Amino acid sequence: MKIAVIGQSLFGQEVYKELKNEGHMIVGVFTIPDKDGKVDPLAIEAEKDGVPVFKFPRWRLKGKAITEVVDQYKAVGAELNVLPFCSQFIPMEVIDHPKHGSIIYHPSLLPRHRGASAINWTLIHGDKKGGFTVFWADDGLDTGPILLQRECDVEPNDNVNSIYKRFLFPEGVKGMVEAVRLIATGKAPRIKQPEEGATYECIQKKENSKIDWNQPAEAIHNWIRGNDRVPGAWAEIDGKSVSFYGSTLLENDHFSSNGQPLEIPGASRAALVTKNGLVLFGNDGKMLLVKNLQFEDGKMIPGSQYFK
């Protein structure tokens, strides 16, 4: 069938490629502008294939849909919109335009974790199960009826990147293809999302990913891994903002106290720079180990080398 892809990133690129190779006519690709030496991966791939590529900075202005962008969208005549990681607000005029409406990939077990940082909050809350949902867009925020869903186990030391790469990305592409297949054969369902279990969490930016040290080590570990790599959990250390990556909870080594004491403002207790990384303490006195640190200038550095 005729499909418009509205999204961005590698995931968008992969969904576009698999849908095209399934035999679907991609009539248009709607993604983000270059910024600015960098073209979005979905834009690159579609352009290679001679598919119309649109780079709208925005779809609406002062709450109202922008007519130019809506008409340009409608010109390609999609019978279905597919939205893999759309970071822009898409007007319901576009959403409802095609024959089959629009479907959206969302990396949580809806109705849990509605909102654009679902993966982060899956880990921040320490969920044991995670996964993705493909759902039909309605006017709400990730509230639309479910087409399909897929589950995976969350690992104790999963960060955003690892759960994404192990399951959410590759199984997500497969799930998007299967969903379009179900729509094409005419048997895709619409399961109204249940009320119970529904949550929303805020979008994770640098501005709101600052570490609260007054928590158990397990909560701090979850916060750090739940923002690793993006946007990066951070705290102040000796004057400057430092991001923490590659966390794991520890057991019983004592501690080995062979490490070098590192004062961290607000921390329950001074940290330890050890040969294996930065040992941090929660308010329960329990430890986590951070592998890497990054400073204001994106300079990444192993935790073990803070002083060295």
Author numbering: 1 to 308
What does the paper say about this structure?
10-Formyltetrahydrofolate dehydrogenase (FDH), which is composed of a small N-terminal domain (Nt-FDH) and a large C-terminal domain, is an abundant folate enzyme in the liver and converts 10-formyltetrahydrofolate (10-FTHF) to tetrahydrofolate (THF) and CO2. Nt-FDH alone possesses a hydrolase activity, which converts 10-FTHF to THF and formate in the presence of β-mercaptoethanol. The N-terminal hydrolase domain of FDH (Nt-FDH) binds folate and is homologous to glycinamide ribonucleotide formyltransferase (GART) and methionyl-tRNA formyltransferase (FMT), enzymes that are crucial for de novo purine biosynthesis and translation initiation, respectively. In this study, we determined crystal structures of zebrafish wild-type apo Nt-FDH (zNt-FDH) and its ternary complexes with the substrate 10-formyl-5,8-dideazafolate (10-FDDF) and the products tetrahydrofolate (THF) and formate.
